[PDB]
Ligand binder design. Sequence first.
Ligand SMILES: NCCCCc1ccccc1
Ligand SMILES: [Ca+2]
Length: 223
Amino acid sequence: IVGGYTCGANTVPYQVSLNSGYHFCGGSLINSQWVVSAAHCYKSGIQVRLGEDNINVVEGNEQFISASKSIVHPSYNSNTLNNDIMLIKLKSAASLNSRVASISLPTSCASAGTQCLISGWGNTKSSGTSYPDVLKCLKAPILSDSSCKSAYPGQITSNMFCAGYLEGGKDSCQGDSGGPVVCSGKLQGIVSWGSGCAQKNKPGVYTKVCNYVSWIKQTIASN
Ligand SMILES: NCCCCc1ccccc1
Ligand SMILES: [Ca+2]
């Protein structure tokens, strides 16, 4: 997260860190045994880390649980990142509490101008590299579909939206991938891609979760 703030411990209780010996992507807890992330975060050997603030220190509210199954979206295209969504089932159910809680799926899509909360442990610089240990947060509005498509000609599909600031300075970045965009209490986006971070006229692109709710609900119910 570039241009954001320190969230504070456990203030984003649905935020997960995906770990394969190191943090590599975020995700969102959507019930006790299922996490939503980006398909581009797919890998073997994932441990889901719940209840994290500092990812390099054991602070007392963590739950570490191996993934038992990953399900990349049937139509994920790694070339274009269309359908950049993946479900991860936990080997055992998380113990739900204050510090570890699920986030609701959308009932309908969000509108341009709606403010959302984006969070992660990604790079905090556009001027180089610096990875935080504690969770970072950013409030940002959903941008109009036309400003998104103007920013990224030929590359935005109906399964994507842009959020942030065309002026630059405030964005998601490397390491935030797969994490949440929460608007009005619902998971409306997943950190998906962009051109650099926090650059002028290049806002972040996010998977549009409202298009996937029926797939998520059917998949969970069958698995
Ligand atoms: N604002 C876009 C978010 C950055 C996502 C990302 C994923 C993988 C490699 C670099 C960046
Ligand atoms: Ca920790």
